[PDB]
Amino acid sequence: PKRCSMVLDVAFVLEGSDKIGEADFNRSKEFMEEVIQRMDVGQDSIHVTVLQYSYMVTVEYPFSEAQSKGDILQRVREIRYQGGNRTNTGLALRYLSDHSFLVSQGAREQAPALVYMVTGNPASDEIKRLPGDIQVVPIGVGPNANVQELERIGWPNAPILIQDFETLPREAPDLVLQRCSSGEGLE
Ligand code: NA
């Protein structure tokens, strides 16, 4: 099984809108749980922050809190589907650059920054250019993803396109960990 063991600050950003729905959001959670389980999460290795967004953005787990796999996974289990009426992807991205990845919020100065963002709908809001240092790998799930929007957000990273949320926990973890370890997408 593909492994990722390195000094890395990883963010998971999950769309939890009404358009996603509780059932598909739970599949996104299960995808995320599987990835964290496979990752070498620890104080001296991979660190994890988790965000959920729709109408607003919730920091479900900051970098500043205990970086053990057990503490992260248990908070993840506690995460509740918000079900908002918007897909404010631009706001979620602003959180990453202006809050999540700050040293004052637990991020490591020497660690590279990597974001896996699971979304199934076009952004409701304006998306602004992220600082190049924050690498975003968009995971566009389902027929309603705005692929060109995700390509622009992602560059240099190709979006990972998944047919549906049922396939997400089955297919995506392998691809996510390959990207984690190598630093680049496939082919
Ligand atoms: Na960082």
Q: Residue 140 in contact with residue 164, Cβ under 8 Å?
A: no
The alpha carbon of 111 and the centre of ligand 1 are apart by a number of angstroms equal to: 5
The alpha carbon of 116 and the centre of ligand 1 are apart by a number of angstroms equal to: 14
Angle of the 69-78 helix axis to the 22-38 helix axis, nearest 10 = 180
The alpha carbon of 179 and the centre of ligand 1 are apart by a number of angstroms equal to: 17
Domains and CATH numbers, the chain: 1-187 (3.40.50.410)
The alpha carbon of 48 and the centre of ligand 1 are apart by a number of angstroms equal to: 11
Which residues line ion ligand 1, judged by CB < 5 Å? 9, 107, 111, 113
Q: Residue 167 in contact with residue 139, Cβ under 8 Å?
A: no
Q: Are strands 8-15 and 46-53 parallel, antiparallel or unpaired?
A: parallel
Rounded Cα distance, 117 and 139, in Å: 6
SS3 state of residue 154: helix
The alpha carbon of 114 and the centre of ligand 1 are apart by a number of angstroms equal to: 8
Angle of the 22-38 helix axis to the 168-182 helix axis, nearest 10 = 40
Task: Please report where in the chains the tokens 């926990």 appear, as a residue.
Answer: 169
Q: Residue 185 in contact with residue 158, Cβ under 8 Å?
A: yes
Q: CA triplet 11, 176, 34: central angle to 5 degrees?
A: 80
Q: From edge to edge, which strands make up the β-sheet containing 113-119?
A: 57-61, 46-53, 8-15, 113-119, 134-141, 160-162
Q: Residue 87 in contact with residue 15, Cβ under 8 Å?
A: yes
| Resolution of the structure, angstroms | 2.0
Method of determination is X-ray
